[PDB]
Every structure is written in structure tokens, then in C-alpha cells.
Amino acid sequence: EVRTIKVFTTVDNINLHTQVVDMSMTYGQQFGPTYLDGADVTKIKPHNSHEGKTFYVLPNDDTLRVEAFEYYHTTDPSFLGRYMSALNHTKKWKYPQVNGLTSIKWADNNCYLATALLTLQQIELKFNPPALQDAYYRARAGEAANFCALILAYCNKTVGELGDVRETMSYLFQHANLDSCKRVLNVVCKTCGQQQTTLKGVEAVMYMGTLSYEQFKKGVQIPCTCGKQATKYLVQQESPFVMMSAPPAQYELKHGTFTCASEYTGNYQCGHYKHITSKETLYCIDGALLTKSSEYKGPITDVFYKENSYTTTIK
Numbered sequence: 001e002v003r004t005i006k007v008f009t010t011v012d013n014i015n016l017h018t019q020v021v022d023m024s025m026t027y028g029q030q031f032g033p034t035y036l037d038g039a040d041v042t043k044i045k046p047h048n049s050h051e052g053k054t055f056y057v058l059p060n061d062d063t064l065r066v067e068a069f070e071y072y073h074t075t076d077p078s079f080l081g082r083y084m085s086a087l088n089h090t091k092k093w094k095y096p097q098v099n100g101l102t103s104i105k106w107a108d109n110n111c112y113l114a115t116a117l118l119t120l121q122q123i124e125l126k127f128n129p130p131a132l133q134d135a136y137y138r139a140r141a142g143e144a145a146n147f148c149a150l151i152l153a154y155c156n157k158t159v160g161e162l163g164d165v166r167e168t169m170s171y172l173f174q175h176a177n178l179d180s181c182k183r184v185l186n187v188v189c190k191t192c193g194q195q196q197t198t199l200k201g202v203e204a205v206m207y208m209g210t211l212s213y214e215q216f217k218k219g220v221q222i223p224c225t226c227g228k229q230a231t232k233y234l235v236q237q238e239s240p241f242v243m244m245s246a247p248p249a250q251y252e253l254k255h256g257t258f259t260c261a262s263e264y265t266g267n268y269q270c271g272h273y274k275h276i277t278s279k280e281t282l283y284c285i286d287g288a289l290l291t292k293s294s295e296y297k298g299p300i301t302d303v304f305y306k307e308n309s310y311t312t313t314i315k
């Protein structure tokens with residue numbers, strides 16, 4: 001007896017493609033690698049319960065290639081498989097609402113993702129790939145599994161792998177519209193004089209070397225090519241936020257002087273992130289866990305600040 005069912009294939013879970021599959025052959029033999037809501041069904045034969053369901057496949061013809069690029073803005077051949085592999089895990093995570101924000105209950109070393117997600121909900125940022133637009137909208141509403149699996153895929157991290165918050169934000173910023181953001185800096189060495197620089201996009205909102213926005217405005221010491229120490233300060237800033245980052249160090253966070261921050265305890269091979277947010281008071285969100293305090297001191301590694309337009313008074 002020849003038996004078939006109708007299923008749909010997809011690469012973006014919006015555009016569907018009608019298929020008839022032989023129930024005597026695996027999905028793999030018929031589609032190549034195939035996934036059902038993140039589960040790898042390549043080696044599985046069609047079941048009656050599969051009729052009418054949507055399966056993800058890899059882009060193996062020009063129509064799927066165009067749909068996949070339009071939705072994800074990547075042509076990395078292994079992207080969809082990495083996204084499905086992650087999703088199969090993230091759909092099992094819990095996403096509690098903590099002080100009004102979608103968080104993530106700790107699992108699989110996902111603390112860096114929780115503090116990244118919590119941060120995104122506090123800064124003005126629009127993503128460019130539809131995949132991120134759609135999944136972030138769902139994440140804000142509490143259903144963050146697809147958004148987390150996409151972050152993992154875009155950052156080329158697997159579930160359980162140790163992640164860095166600054167690197168993760170850089171990847172997400174790369175897929176955001178930051179074209180309006182601009183930064184002017186001035187570098188002063190006593191032997192070589194001055195040199196001003198202009199930064200755009202992601203580079204205009206990220207800085208590595210100091211956590212304090214005020215000190216960035218007043219000046220920071222860096223090496224110069226002659227062996228002297230030069231000073232660098234912020235001349236002009238046009239952006240809706242800024243992100244200041246540094247190797248983890250004991251740092252004091254004062255209520256009302258920043259938006260949110262990341263705290264890292266541990267070492268370079270393993271550790272743990274927490275998120276600090278400045279609301280009526282300082283709240284520390286550690287996945288599902290919430291505590292409060294009037295003042296905060298701890299090993300901070302990233303601080304986010306609101307911004308619209310800043311121009312220095314320094315001459």
C-alpha cells in the first residue's frame with residue numbers, strides 16, 4: 001500500500017510550501033534535514049499526526065534561498081540547523097516576568113542571555129531582520145523562546161556554551177538600525193598633539209575601557225605610539241543610549257545615574273552574570289530571582305546610559 005500525507009515545508013514559518021510525503025520514507029530522504037518545532041525529524045518516517053503540520057527545511061532551491069535571506073539576513077549554510085537545535089532547548093526554558101520585564105529562569109549557562117534580554121527591553125533599538133523583529137515582539141510579550149534561539153544562532157553559540165554580554169550585544173547591534181548614531185572623540189598626546197575621530201553605527205554606541213559615562217566625557221588615559229600616555233574624551237554623541245564596558249572590576253552603581261548594568265562574578269572559563277536595573281530603587285534580576293537595594297557595589301562589566309544629543313564644553 002502506498003501511503004502519503006500532506007505537510008508544509010518552510011524556512012520562515014510564514015511562507016508555506018505544499019508537499020506530499022511517502023510514509024515509507026524518512027523526511028531526510030525526501031527533504032534533506034527536516035525539523036518540527038526544533039526537533040530533528042530527518043531520520044523519522046512521517047506519522048499520521050504530522051498531516052497538515054509545518055516542517056522547517058534547509059534552503060535547497062532558489063525560492064527558499066530568497067525567503068530565508070529576506071527573513072534572517074544571513075546566508076550561513078548552517079544557520080537554520082543551529083537555530084532549530086537551539087530552539088529545541090529554549091522552548092523548554094521558562095520566561096518569568098520580573099519587575100515588568102521578560103527574564104529567563106536559569107538553565108544551560110543562559111545568564112548572559114537573560115541580562116542581554118533584560119537590557120534590550122530598557123533601551124531604544126529596532127532590529128532589521130524580520131526574524132528578530134517578530135521574535136523580539138513575542139519575547140517582550142513573554143514568549144522569548146524563538147528570540148533566544150535566534151540570538152544563539154546569530155552569535156554562533158550553542159545552548160550551554162559560556163557567553164559574553166558585550167560580544168552578544170555587538171552581534172545584536174550589528175542587526176539593528178543604528179545608522180543615525182554618531183560619536184566624535186578627541187585624542188590628546190603632549191608629544192604628538194591632537195587627533196579627532198568620528199565613529200558611526202555600532203562603534204558610536206559601544207566603548208571598551210571605562211564603565212563611567214562621565215569619565216569618558218572628562219577624559220581617559222590610553223597608550224600612544226611614542227610610549228607616552230594620551231587622553232581621550234568625548235566631543236559629541238548622537239544616540240538614544242550608550243554602552244560602556246570594561247573588564248570586570250569592583251564598581252559602585254548609584255540610583256538614578258544609569259539605566260541598567262551587567263555584573264559578572266567568576267573567571268574567564270566560567271562565571272555568572274546578573275542584571276542591575278535602576279528604577280524607583282536598584283533591582284538586581286538574576287534570572288527568575290529578584291532582590292533590591294539602595295546602593296550597589298560589585299564586579300560590573302557593562303553599564304548602559306540614556307542619551308539623545310551631547311556636546312562637550314571642553315575646548
Ligand SMILES: COc1cc(/C(C)=N/NC(N)=S)ccc1O
Pocket residue numbers: 058059060064065066068069074075076077078079080081
Ligand atoms: C543551506 O542553508 C542555508 C541557506 C541560506 C541561504 C538563503 N543561502 N542563499 C544563498 N546563499 S543565495 C541561509 C541559511 C541557511 O541555513
Ligand SMILES: [Cl-]
Pocket residue numbers: 089090092107108
Ligand atoms: Cl535544555
Ligand SMILES: [Cl-]
Pocket residue numbers: 125126127128132133136
Ligand atoms: Cl525590532
Ligand SMILES: [Cl-]
Pocket residue numbers: 293295296297298
Ligand atoms: Cl551590593
Ligand SMILES: [Zn+2]
Pocket residue numbers: 189190191192224225226227228230
Ligand atoms: Zn605620542
